[PDB]
Ligand binder design. Structure first.
Ligand SMILES: [Fe+3]
Lengths: 49, 52
């Protein structure tokens, strides 16, 4: 009661600035920065015949 | 600055107190009095009240 300060905690909600764990071999999650750093440099397959 | 109760003589023998009507603009401390009132429960939620 009184002056009540409500944030995402007392409602058990995710923060606006929140991040999930990176995906593992058996877990689903964010894609890691170095995963993309490996992906982009990986040249696309060459289409010949 | 005294509060005087007005007395009026009834028909048989008595002298009863009677009240005069006043307008809401007449009482001199009414607005401060109603301003000083505070809500019992949550006054405001996250800086906002009423229909929240
Ligand atoms: Fe999320």
């Amino acid at each position: 009661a009184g002056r009540v300060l409500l944030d995402a905690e007392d409602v058990h909600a995710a923060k606006k600035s929140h991040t999930h764990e990176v995906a593992t071999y058996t877990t689903d999650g964010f894609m890691s920065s170095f995963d993309k750093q490996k992906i982009d440099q990986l040249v696309s397959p060459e289409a010949g015949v | 600055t005294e509060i005087k109760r007005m007395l009026q003589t009834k028909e048989d023998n008595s002298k009863e107190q009677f009240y005069p009507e006043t307008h809401v603009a007449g009482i001199v401390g009414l607005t401060e009095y109603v301003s000083g009132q505070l809500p019992t429960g949550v006054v405001s939620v996250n800086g906002k009240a009423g229909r929240v």
